[PDB]
Design a protein around this ligand. Structure first.
Ligand SMILES: [Mg+2]
Ligand SMILES: [Mg+2]
Ligand SMILES: [Mg+2]
Length: 263
């Protein structure tokens, strides 16, 4: 069974490479996953190659090799981020990737960080291919941004043959950003063909004082939905798993990763 993870790593820049403790936790988290979306990559050179070197040192299983695809730098101006997908080479490959663009009226309007959509081929799963649409919203505009994910789904269906979709990332989908009353105006929730694997009662925040399901996974496509391994869909508490204190865990990230498994 293949594990797919999304992980918001707070400010993953050159500085973070120097905290060996935090970096070792991040590597361990990645090593549990066959595909992992990493968000908040911030660098104008290369942080994604150091990570691959680190992950490919034990050249183990004569081939548990990892590769990556990374988006362009996305934002309004000086403040840019990248989405990266790290994946086990021998288990999946990238068929195509593109940056969503709204050809109608306002062209850079809704997303500050346009989804970097990636079409994966997966010869060993029941579902032979799927598309991952990642999103990292700006907190105060999460209602609109999450809602607009149905327009990305439409665009991808027009462009590619694809039937199976995974929407994942940091939607900021809780607490004061997306209150209970606002779910009514989000088509990604009110259309029930979209299946939510992380529910509104989950805690994706490392801090003990907060309990919000900021990070999410949503599927569409009857094939992929019915291929989810029962009980696999969860928050991975890396703090409890590696016996870290709150301070050590906050050095890694402010967010826990979310994940599920596919048959
Ligand atoms: Mg942040
Ligand atoms: Mg945030
Ligand atoms: Mg918490």
């Amino acid at each position: 069974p293949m594990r797919i993870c999304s992980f918001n790593v707070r400010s993953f820049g050159e500085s973070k490479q120097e905290d060996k403790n935090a970096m070792d936790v991040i590597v361990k988290v990645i090593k549990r996953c066959d595909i992992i979306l990493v968000m908040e990559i911030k660098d104008s050179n290369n942080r994604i190659c150091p990570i691959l070197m680190e992950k490919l040192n034990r050249n183990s299983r004569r081939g548990i090799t990892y590769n990556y695809v990374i988006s362009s730098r996305l934002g309004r101006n000086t403040y840019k981020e990248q989405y990266a997908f790290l994946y086990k080479e021998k288990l999946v490959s990238v068929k195509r990737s593109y940056h969503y663009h709204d050809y109608q009226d306002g062209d850079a309007d809704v997303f500050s960080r346009e989804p970097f959509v990636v079409w994966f081929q997966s010869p060993h799963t029941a579902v032979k291919d799927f598309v991952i649409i990642p999103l990292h919203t700006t907190p105060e505009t999460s209602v609109k941004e999450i809602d607009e994910l149905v327009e990305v789904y439409t665009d991808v269906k027009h462009r590619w043959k694809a039937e199976n979709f995974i929407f994942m990332g940091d939607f900021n989908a809780g607490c004061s950003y997306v209150p209970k009353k606002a779910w009514k105006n989000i088509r990604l929730r009110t259309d029930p063909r979209f299946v939510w694997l992380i529910g509104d009662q989950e805690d994706t925040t490392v801090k003990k004082s907060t309990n919000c399901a900021y990070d999410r996974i949503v599927l569409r496509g009857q094939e992929i939905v019915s291929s989810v391994v029962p009980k696999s869909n969860s928050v991975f508490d890396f703090q409890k798993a590696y016996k870290l204190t709150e301070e050590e865990a906050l050095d890694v990230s402010d967010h826990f990763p979310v994940e599920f498994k596919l048959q």
